Amino acid sequence: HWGYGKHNGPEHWHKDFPIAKGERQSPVDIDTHTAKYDPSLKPLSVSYDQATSLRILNNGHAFNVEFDDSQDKAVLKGGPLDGTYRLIQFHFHWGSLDGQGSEHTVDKKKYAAELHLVHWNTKYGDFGKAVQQPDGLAVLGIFLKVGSAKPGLQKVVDVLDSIKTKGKSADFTNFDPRGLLPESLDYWTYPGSLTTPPLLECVTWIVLKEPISVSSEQVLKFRKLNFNGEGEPEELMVDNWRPAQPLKNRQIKASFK
Ligand SMILES: O=C(O)Sc1ccc(O)cc1O
Ligand SMILES: Oc1ccc(S)c(O)c1
Ligand SMILES: [Zn+2]
């Protein structure tokens, strides 16, 4: 099946997922000089005070932190969105080296990693229905650069030891995702897709302008995870990012001038 190596990586995905060559694929490079400032855009509203985290999982292509999404506890509203989007999970993409790892780029600049906070439009009742709709998902993308440590990230990095291989999970309660946000919520937004198979074109991307800083030791622990299951040859979980895709007939909009 699919992954990120030479024989099953992104340049091969289109044979099983033909939408990979679709018209609204992600990620993309954000050219900051051709993005359109849009005064019509509202500030984002992040209400994460009642988030209920459940579990952290190694799924063979990243680690996911999963939330209880049976009620409007942790929601995203405003910005370019219509309606209420519930948080269901977050994950990261990262590199083998600090000079690469993000999926979106900014004027061709790569960051060391990218955080994806995945939300689905409550109007469609569950996540499974939402991914079949052009306005079904809203994904907050946040860049990570290497510098000072991020206190709110350390609880995540401390548990990675326990989910090193594919299929492992651990209880992960009382984690507050507010500690992963930058100070400013200025953003770029464009319509796009999941960046992993099945690559569905159901995502409103909201990419924050301001990165968060993490220390080298924090992202080093990310790179110790494994793509393989226990009892298999070890393949380190690194470079789980898809390269930038042709923007084609879209305009990236900015919430700031
Ligand atoms: O995060 C996931 O992807 S796992 C999950 C599945 C369904 C659900 O309603 C809530 C979840 O957190
Ligand atoms: O549900 C999702 C899985 C992976 C990725 S990159 C998403 O953006 C959503
Ligand atoms: Zn992602």
CSV table of C-alpha atoms and ligand atoms in Angstrom, one decimal:
chain,number,residue,atom,x,y,z
A,1,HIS,CA,0.0,0.0,0.0
A,2,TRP,CA,0.9,3.7,-0.1
A,3,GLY,CA,3.5,5.5,2.0
A,4,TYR,CA,6.5,7.8,1.5
A,5,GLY,CA,9.3,5.7,0.1
A,6,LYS,CA,10.7,5.4,-3.5
A,7,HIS,CA,8.4,2.6,-4.5
A,8,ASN,CA,5.1,3.7,-2.9
A,9,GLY,CA,5.4,7.4,-2.3
A,10,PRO,CA,3.5,10.4,-3.6
A,11,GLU,CA,4.6,10.1,-7.2
A,12,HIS,CA,2.9,6.7,-7.2
A,13,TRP,CA,-0.4,7.6,-5.4
A,14,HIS,CA,-2.2,8.5,-8.6
A,15,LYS,CA,-2.4,4.9,-9.8
A,16,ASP,CA,-4.7,3.9,-6.9
A,17,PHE,CA,-6.1,7.4,-6.2
A,18,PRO,CA,-6.6,9.1,-9.5
A,19,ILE,CA,-7.9,12.2,-7.8
A,20,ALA,CA,-4.2,12.8,-7.0
A,21,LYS,CA,-4.1,14.7,-10.3
A,22,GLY,CA,-7.3,16.5,-9.5
A,23,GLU,CA,-8.0,20.3,-9.8
A,24,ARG,CA,-8.0,21.2,-6.1
A,25,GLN,CA,-5.1,19.2,-4.6
A,26,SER,CA,-3.0,20.1,-1.6
A,27,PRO,CA,-0.5,21.2,-0.5
A,28,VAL,CA,0.5,24.3,-2.5
A,29,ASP,CA,3.1,26.9,-2.4
A,30,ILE,CA,1.8,30.2,-1.0
A,31,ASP,CA,3.1,33.1,-3.1
A,32,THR,CA,2.8,35.9,-0.7
A,33,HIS,CA,2.9,38.5,-3.4
A,34,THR,CA,0.0,37.1,-5.4
A,35,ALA,CA,-2.3,36.2,-2.5
A,36,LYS,CA,-5.3,38.6,-2.4
A,37,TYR,CA,-6.1,40.4,0.7
A,38,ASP,CA,-9.8,40.0,1.4
A,39,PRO,CA,-11.5,42.5,3.8
A,40,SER,CA,-14.5,40.3,3.5
A,41,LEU,CA,-12.8,37.8,5.7
A,42,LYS,CA,-13.7,37.5,9.3
A,43,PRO,CA,-11.3,36.7,12.2
A,44,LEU,CA,-11.1,33.1,13.1
A,45,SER,CA,-12.9,31.9,16.2
A,46,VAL,CA,-11.2,29.0,18.0
A,47,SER,CA,-13.1,27.7,21.0
A,48,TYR,CA,-11.0,24.9,22.5
A,49,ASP,CA,-11.7,25.5,26.2
A,50,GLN,CA,-13.8,22.3,26.4
A,51,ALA,CA,-11.6,20.0,24.3
A,52,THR,CA,-11.7,16.4,25.3
A,53,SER,CA,-8.6,14.5,24.1
A,54,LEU,CA,-8.9,10.6,24.1
A,55,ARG,CA,-5.9,8.8,22.6
A,56,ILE,CA,-2.8,9.1,20.6
A,57,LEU,CA,-2.2,6.6,17.8
A,58,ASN,CA,0.6,5.6,15.5
A,59,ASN,CA,-1.2,4.8,12.2
A,60,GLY,CA,1.8,3.9,10.1
A,61,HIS,CA,2.0,7.3,8.4
A,62,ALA,CA,1.9,9.8,11.3
A,63,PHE,CA,0.7,9.9,14.9
A,64,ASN,CA,-2.8,11.2,15.5
A,65,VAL,CA,-4.1,12.8,18.7
A,66,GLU,CA,-7.9,12.0,18.8
A,67,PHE,CA,-10.7,14.0,20.4
A,68,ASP,CA,-14.3,13.3,21.5
A,69,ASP,CA,-16.4,15.0,18.7
A,70,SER,CA,-19.8,13.8,19.9
A,71,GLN,CA,-20.7,17.3,21.0
A,72,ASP,CA,-19.6,20.9,20.3
A,73,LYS,CA,-16.7,21.0,22.8
A,74,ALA,CA,-13.9,22.2,20.6
A,75,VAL,CA,-14.9,24.1,17.5
A,76,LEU,CA,-13.7,26.3,14.8
A,77,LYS,CA,-15.9,29.1,13.4
A,78,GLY,CA,-15.6,32.3,11.5
A,79,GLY,CA,-12.8,33.1,9.0
A,80,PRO,CA,-14.0,31.9,5.6
A,81,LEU,CA,-16.2,29.2,7.1
A,82,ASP,CA,-19.9,28.8,7.1
A,83,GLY,CA,-21.2,27.2,10.3
A,84,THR,CA,-19.5,25.1,13.0
A,85,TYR,CA,-16.6,22.7,12.6
A,86,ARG,CA,-15.7,20.2,15.2
A,87,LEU,CA,-12.2,19.2,16.1
A,88,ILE,CA,-11.7,15.5,15.6
A,89,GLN,CA,-7.9,15.0,15.5
A,90,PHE,CA,-4.5,16.6,15.0
A,91,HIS,CA,-1.3,15.3,13.5
A,92,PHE,CA,2.0,16.5,12.1
A,93,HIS,CA,4.1,16.0,9.0
A,94,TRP,CA,7.9,16.4,9.4
A,95,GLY,CA,11.3,16.0,7.8
A,96,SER,CA,14.5,14.0,8.2
A,97,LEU,CA,16.4,17.4,8.4
A,98,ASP,CA,15.4,20.7,9.9
A,99,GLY,CA,15.3,22.3,6.3
A,100,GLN,CA,12.3,20.3,5.2
A,101,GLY,CA,9.2,18.7,6.6
A,102,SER,CA,6.3,21.1,6.0
A,103,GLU,CA,3.7,20.4,3.3
A,104,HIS,CA,2.7,24.0,2.5
A,105,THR,CA,5.5,26.3,1.6
A,106,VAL,CA,5.7,30.1,1.7
A,107,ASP,CA,7.5,31.7,-1.2
A,108,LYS,CA,9.1,28.3,-1.6
A,109,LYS,CA,10.3,28.3,2.0
A,110,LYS,CA,10.0,24.9,3.7
A,111,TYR,CA,9.5,24.7,7.5
A,112,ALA,CA,10.7,21.8,9.7
A,113,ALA,CA,7.2,20.4,10.3
A,114,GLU,CA,3.5,21.2,9.9
A,115,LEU,CA,0.7,20.7,12.3
A,116,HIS,CA,-2.8,19.9,10.9
A,117,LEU,CA,-5.8,20.4,13.2
A,118,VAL,CA,-8.7,18.6,11.5
A,119,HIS,CA,-12.3,19.8,11.9
A,120,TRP,CA,-15.5,18.7,10.2
A,121,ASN,CA,-18.7,20.5,9.4
A,122,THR,CA,-21.4,19.6,11.9
A,123,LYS,CA,-24.0,20.0,9.4
A,124,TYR,CA,-23.2,16.6,7.9
A,125,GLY,CA,-23.6,14.8,11.1
A,126,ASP,CA,-20.3,12.8,11.2
A,127,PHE,CA,-16.8,12.9,9.7
A,128,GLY,CA,-17.5,10.1,7.3
A,129,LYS,CA,-20.3,12.1,5.6
A,130,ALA,CA,-18.4,15.3,5.8
A,131,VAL,CA,-15.4,14.1,3.7
A,132,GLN,CA,-17.7,13.5,0.8
A,133,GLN,CA,-18.6,17.3,0.7
A,134,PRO,CA,-16.7,20.2,-0.9
A,135,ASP,CA,-17.2,22.2,2.3
A,136,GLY,CA,-16.9,19.2,4.7
A,137,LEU,CA,-13.5,19.8,6.4
A,138,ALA,CA,-11.6,22.7,7.7
A,139,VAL,CA,-8.0,22.1,8.5
A,140,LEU,CA,-5.9,24.6,10.4
A,141,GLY,CA,-2.3,24.3,9.3
A,142,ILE,CA,0.5,25.7,11.5
A,143,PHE,CA,4.2,25.8,10.7
A,144,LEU,CA,6.9,24.7,13.0
A,145,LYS,CA,10.4,26.1,12.9
A,146,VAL,CA,13.4,25.1,15.0
A,147,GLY,CA,14.3,27.4,17.8
A,148,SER,CA,13.1,27.6,21.4
A,149,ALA,CA,11.1,24.8,23.0
A,150,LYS,CA,7.3,24.9,23.0
A,151,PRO,CA,6.0,24.0,26.5
A,152,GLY,CA,2.6,23.0,25.2
A,153,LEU,CA,4.1,20.4,22.9
A,154,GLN,CA,6.2,18.5,25.5
A,155,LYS,CA,3.3,16.3,26.8
A,156,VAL,CA,3.0,15.0,23.2
A,157,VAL,CA,6.7,14.4,22.8
A,158,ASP,CA,7.0,12.6,26.1
A,159,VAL,CA,4.4,9.9,25.1
A,160,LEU,CA,5.9,9.0,21.7
A,161,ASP,CA,8.0,6.3,23.3
A,162,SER,CA,4.9,4.3,23.9
A,163,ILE,CA,3.5,4.4,20.4
A,164,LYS,CA,6.7,3.9,18.4
A,165,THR,CA,5.4,1.3,15.9
A,166,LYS,CA,2.4,1.1,13.7
A,167,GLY,CA,-0.9,0.2,15.3
A,168,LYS,CA,0.2,1.2,18.8
A,169,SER,CA,-2.1,3.5,20.8
A,170,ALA,CA,-2.0,5.1,24.3
A,171,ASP,CA,-4.5,6.9,26.5
A,172,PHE,CA,-4.0,10.6,26.0
A,173,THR,CA,-6.5,12.5,28.2
A,174,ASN,CA,-6.6,16.1,29.4
A,175,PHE,CA,-4.4,17.5,26.6
A,176,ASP,CA,-5.1,21.2,25.8
A,177,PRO,CA,-4.5,22.0,22.2
A,178,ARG,CA,-4.5,25.7,23.0
A,179,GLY,CA,-0.9,25.4,23.9
A,180,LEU,CA,-0.1,24.7,20.2
A,181,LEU,CA,-1.4,28.0,18.8
A,182,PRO,CA,0.8,31.0,17.8
A,183,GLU,CA,0.0,34.4,19.2
A,184,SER,CA,-1.6,35.8,16.0
A,185,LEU,CA,-4.4,34.1,14.1
A,186,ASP,CA,-3.7,35.9,10.7
A,187,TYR,CA,-4.1,33.4,7.9
A,188,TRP,CA,-4.2,32.4,4.2
A,189,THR,CA,-7.1,30.4,2.9
A,190,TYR,CA,-7.7,28.4,-0.3
A,191,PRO,CA,-9.9,25.3,-1.2
A,192,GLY,CA,-8.0,22.1,-1.4
A,193,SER,CA,-7.7,18.5,-0.3
A,194,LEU,CA,-6.4,15.9,2.1
A,195,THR,CA,-2.6,15.6,1.6
A,196,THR,CA,-2.7,11.8,2.1
A,197,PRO,CA,-4.8,9.2,0.4
A,198,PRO,CA,-7.7,9.2,-0.3
A,199,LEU,CA,-6.8,12.8,-1.2
A,200,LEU,CA,-10.5,13.9,-1.2
A,201,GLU,CA,-11.2,17.4,-2.3
A,202,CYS,CA,-13.2,18.4,0.8
A,203,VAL,CA,-11.0,20.8,2.7
A,204,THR,CA,-11.1,24.5,3.3
A,205,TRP,CA,-7.4,25.2,4.2
A,206,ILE,CA,-6.6,27.8,6.8
A,207,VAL,CA,-2.9,28.3,7.0
A,208,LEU,CA,-1.6,30.5,9.8
A,209,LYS,CA,1.0,33.1,9.0
A,210,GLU,CA,2.9,32.9,12.2
A,211,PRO,CA,4.9,29.7,12.9
A,212,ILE,CA,5.4,28.2,16.4
A,213,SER,CA,8.9,27.5,17.5
A,214,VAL,CA,9.9,24.0,18.8
A,215,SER,CA,13.3,22.9,20.0
A,216,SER,CA,15.6,20.6,18.0
A,217,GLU,CA,15.3,18.0,20.8
A,218,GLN,CA,11.5,18.1,20.5
A,219,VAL,CA,11.4,17.4,16.7
A,220,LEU,CA,14.2,14.9,17.1
A,221,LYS,CA,11.8,12.7,19.1
A,222,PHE,CA,9.4,12.8,16.2
A,223,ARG,CA,12.0,11.3,14.0
A,224,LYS,CA,12.4,8.2,16.3
A,225,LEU,CA,9.0,6.9,15.4
A,226,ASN,CA,8.6,4.0,13.0
A,227,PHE,CA,6.5,3.4,9.9
A,228,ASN,CA,6.7,-0.3,10.4
A,229,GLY,CA,4.8,-2.5,12.9
A,230,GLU,CA,6.5,-4.2,15.8
A,231,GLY,CA,8.5,-7.2,14.7
A,232,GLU,CA,9.2,-5.8,11.3
A,233,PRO,CA,12.4,-4.3,9.8
A,234,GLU,CA,12.7,-0.7,11.3
A,235,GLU,CA,12.0,2.2,8.9
A,236,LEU,CA,12.1,5.5,10.6
A,237,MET,CA,9.1,7.8,10.3
A,238,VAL,CA,10.6,10.8,8.6
A,239,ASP,CA,9.7,12.9,5.5
A,240,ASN,CA,6.0,12.1,5.7
A,241,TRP,CA,5.1,15.1,3.6
A,242,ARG,CA,3.7,15.5,0.1
A,243,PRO,CA,5.3,18.0,-2.3
A,244,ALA,CA,3.5,21.1,-3.5
A,245,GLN,CA,0.8,20.6,-6.1
A,246,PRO,CA,-0.1,22.9,-9.1
A,247,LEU,CA,-2.4,25.6,-7.8
A,248,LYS,CA,-4.3,25.8,-11.1
A,249,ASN,CA,-7.5,27.8,-11.2
A,250,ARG,CA,-7.6,29.1,-7.6
A,251,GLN,CA,-6.7,32.3,-5.7
A,252,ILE,CA,-5.1,32.1,-2.3
A,253,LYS,CA,-6.8,34.7,-0.1
A,254,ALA,CA,-5.2,36.5,2.9
A,255,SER,CA,-6.8,37.8,6.0
A,256,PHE,CA,-4.2,40.5,6.4
A,257,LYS,CA,-2.6,43.1,4.2
B,1,LIG,O1,-9.3,11.0,15.4
B,1,LIG,C1,-9.7,10.1,14.8
B,1,LIG,O2,-9.5,10.2,13.7
B,1,LIG,S1,-10.5,8.9,15.7
B,1,LIG,C2,-12.1,9.3,15.9
B,1,LIG,C3,-13.0,8.6,15.1
B,1,LIG,C4,-14.3,9.0,15.3
B,1,LIG,C5,-14.7,10.0,16.2
B,1,LIG,O3,-16.0,10.4,16.2
B,1,LIG,C6,-13.8,10.7,16.9
B,1,LIG,C7,-12.4,10.3,16.7
B,1,LIG,O4,-11.6,11.0,17.5
B,2,LIG,O1,-8.3,13.5,8.1
B,2,LIG,C1,-7.1,14.0,7.6
B,2,LIG,C2,-6.0,13.1,7.5
B,2,LIG,C3,-4.8,13.6,6.9
B,2,LIG,C4,-4.7,15.0,6.5
B,2,LIG,S1,-3.3,15.8,5.8
B,2,LIG,C5,-5.8,15.8,6.7
B,2,LIG,O2,-5.6,17.1,6.2
B,2,LIG,C6,-7.0,15.3,7.2
B,3,ZN,ZN,-1.9,16.3,7.4
